[PDB]
Design a protein around this ligand. Structure first.
Ligand SMILES: Nc1ncnc2c1ncn2[C@@H]1O[C@H](COP(=O)(O)CP(=O)(O)O)[C@@H](O)[C@H]1O
Ligand SMILES: Nc1ncnc2c1ncn2[C@@H]1O[C@H](COP(=O)(O)CP(=O)(O)O)[C@@H](O)[C@H]1O
Lengths: 464, 464
């Protein structure tokens, strides 16, 4: 990895575009006015890409050669990078201040600020915009995950009277459905800010390396069939496949994909009749989890539940909602995103089914179907010093007031009612609103302030 | 990077789930029935992740320990993995056959197949599903980028009578808008199958390392302002910003974001009067490229063109469409995806503006707003050998015929009319349909057939 090659091409020329005698460029990240965002993921970037000796004589030469061909010209700022190498032993002269990770913050508030700490390196702040802006992704995954947890909590409370099991109710199965290995680890770690369940091993390793937890792992999984392990038995042997699998995993929970040929038949005749004896013997600590995986997600779930309700001993919990026996559960892993999750739980509640009966798996919906537009993640310059004079800078496009950016030096504060406000134009120096909530997390090549994953989870909790 | 840790967790238990006495699991990848897809990206994954000695004792222990905590149980198949270490010096006993990269293939056809080459390794075919299915992403980016190129081609032809500059009409600005560094490089390279322009330099490194071109670089870029380099001058000095930049880059094309404050004023009064003299003197090889970046994408483009056509000498081309002077162009980079690109060119044609006038930048729309669902990318088992008998396996969910998978051993053929057919149930052996288009690309830890990026581009060409 070469930081000199991890920027948008066109930023290679920007050092020639600033007003002459600019000694300072100060920029900020916000999610422009999903009402509140979880701040997560910056520390990963600081550690993996930004900290330490990131410039070498070989990296300079590599970038020189690449840009010569990419531009067919010599725009590359070889001198500026040589300066950083010689003066700072390749350590970036940059200060980054940030809200603590895990913090839940309303939209349109400053989340982090970047500035150069050497006047020669005015051009550096925005060189690193590209890399730092990728934090949109773990912010957005964490926020969307947390929004889903809010929905799950509402209906579990309504239908059961408590939140037992909540943190296992939405499980990450997005490994194959993301755009890369590196994305898999980052997104899975972001989901684990809110939940405990992941099939994406790389998330755990990222957390261990970049954040740290008290546990050996933050993420968990249970044995489960896939279509290949059922259909390999042949069409006429779906029952033999079912019986082999539940018997192989008779004392731990086991998920079994049941829609290979006919989901309604598998539930009513195979699970509900031929193999019933192997289900009702099972422990509360080791349920069979029936997995539909096709058809209309709500309609399938309701019909699966009605079928099981006629074949197995259903009870009524203290809220008046129907509850399967504890050795039997359902998981819906097909077509799950925030919208369909809401429809499924509302539709279950309407038909008097406890949210205790169900859990969810999500892949693309959880980790891939998300863009920087969802939270309007944006990084803009708000303050420059030119000729020793500091000036408040901003954009304000005529045709879109939503893209208006903030002015001057920024700080984040608690209001007297305990909400958040971002003060502009250096006004946080007036001290009418207490101390700035941003901390310096990076300075001159060093990470200066850090958070364990446990602090992060704590910060990201629902009100409850 | 540990391949034993690069699967969905639940797959760890699948060696216990297949029928006893199974010696072969054969699986295939298709984009289930955007009617034709560009097959691109597998060769990256083969080289980075799959080839050579991928198993070591250290990797085995690491996996063993992680899995003990994740599952809170001993389910990891140490014996299977140790067998591969000792018998094959850690090389994967797997054969993969694939259609050549760059091939454009209709929906619902086999694109690659995977099988174990040693009966002891039956479980390995689907171990590596997760990592292989990640090919959905470069497949999908290349396909969606080619589809935008068809739209571009159509309207450029209709409005100008040729395709000059087509390969430069859609520029990749998606670096900051993707989910990670790795995605950035994979996505940029997939876009370069169809176009020449990227600001994501990692795409170029990937292509050189994994595919190779006779070109010194496969992608190119031009000097461009951002809001920071314009707004830094202060609100009253937009004109000085503009002036400084076009003078810095007088002899090459230069793109200037013009909507910081009021794009309509910038075009009419700043470019159109104040700085008109610095524009009209410019070379055809070095235009000013005006960049709007807000408002309704179509409306803003049209109004920008209306303003400019009143301040600058418009001609009418041989097809009757209006054309700005060669020193003056426009680039829309805001809000651009396949849908809006189509609306803009059609809006332009309706108002009698040539598509020669415009180029497009796309970020999230190009590299991030895509999922596995768009082309229904799917990997499924179609054939097993159990007790020395081959059986044809498939799924066929009652409620969703779109999810029916293919049966038996598969091959891809040219039809007599020159289309594609996938033969099922090993019927390709009857040899009624000429050569199987799938070629072995991986066998037993070695990459066996490679494509340069040059063949890939040639294979992915438009009809025209
Ligand atoms: N064991 C499991 N439990 C719950 N959901 C699962 C699951 N295995 C797979 N899924 C669901 O199915 C997705 C993976 O898609 P598949 O490759 O199994 C089916 P298809 O996309 O080929 O039609 C996951 O992202 C998840 O939503
Ligand atoms: N030089 C340029 N030419 C064309 N489009 C550009 C561009 N620079 C940025 N863009 C467009 O804007 C996207 C980057 O978003 P920005 O951070 O510049 C504005 P915002 O996202 O904060 O509202 C790029 O992916 C691209 O579509």
């Amino acid at each position: 990895f070469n930081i000199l090659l991890a920027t948008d091409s066109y930023k290679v020329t920007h050092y020639k575009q600033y007003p002459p005698n600019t000694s300072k460029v100060y920029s900020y990240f916000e999610c422009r006015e999903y009402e509140e965002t979880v701040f997560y993921g910056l520390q990963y970037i600081l550690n993996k890409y930004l900290k330490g000796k990131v410039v070498t004589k070989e990296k300079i030469q590599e970038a020189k050669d690449v840009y010569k061909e990419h531009f067919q010209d010599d725009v590359f700022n070889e001198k500026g990078w040589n300066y950083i190498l010689e003066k700072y032993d390749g350590h970036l002269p940059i200060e980054i201040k940030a809200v603590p990770e895990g913090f839940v913050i309303p939209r349109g508030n400053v989340l982090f600020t970047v500035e150069n700490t050497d006047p020669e390196c005015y051009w550096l702040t925005n060189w690193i915009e590209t890399i730092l802006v990728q934090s949109w992704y773990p912010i957005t995954v964490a926020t969307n995950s947390r929004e889903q947890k809010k929905i799950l909590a509402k209906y579990l409370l309504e239908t059961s009277g408590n939140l037992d099991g909540l943190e296992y109710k939405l499980h990450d199965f997005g490994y194959r459905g993301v755009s890369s290995q590196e994305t898999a680890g980052i997104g899975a770690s972001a989901h684990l800010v809110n939940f405990k369940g992941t099939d994406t091993v790389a998330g755990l390793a990222l957390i261990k390396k970049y954040y740290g937890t008290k546990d050996p792992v933050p993420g968990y999984s249970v044995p489960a069939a896939e279509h290949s392990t059922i259909t390999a038995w042949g069409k006429d042997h779906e029952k033999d496949a079912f019986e082999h699998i539940v018997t192989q995993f008779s004392s731990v929970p086991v998920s079994v994909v049941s829609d290979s040929y006919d989901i309604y038949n598998a539930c009513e005749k195979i699970w509900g009749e031929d193999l019933r004896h192997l289900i009702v013997s099972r422990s509360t600590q080791a349920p069979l989890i029936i997995r539909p995986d096709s058809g209309n997600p709500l309609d399938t779930v309701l019909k699966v539940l009605e079928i099981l309700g006629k074949k197995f001993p259903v009870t009524e919990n203290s809220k008046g909602y129907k509850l399967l026996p504890p050795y039997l559960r359902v998981i819906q892993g097909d077509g799950v995103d925030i919208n369909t999750l809401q429809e499924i739980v509302e539709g279950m509640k309407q038909k008097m089914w406890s949210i205790e009966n169900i859990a969810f798996g999500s892949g693309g919906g959880l980790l891939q179907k998300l863009t920087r537009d969802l939270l309007n993640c944006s990084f803009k310059c708000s303050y420059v010093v030119t000729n020793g004079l500091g000036i408040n800078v901003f954009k304000d496009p005529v045709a879109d007031p939503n893209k208006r950016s903030k002015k001057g030096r920024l700080s984040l504060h608690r209001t007297p009612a305990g909400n958040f406000v971002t003060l502009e134009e250096g006004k946080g120096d007036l001290e009418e609103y207490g101390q700035d909530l941003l901390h310096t997390v990076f300075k001159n090549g060093k990470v200066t302030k850090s958070y364990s994953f446990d602090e992060i989870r704590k910060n990201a909790q629902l009100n409850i």
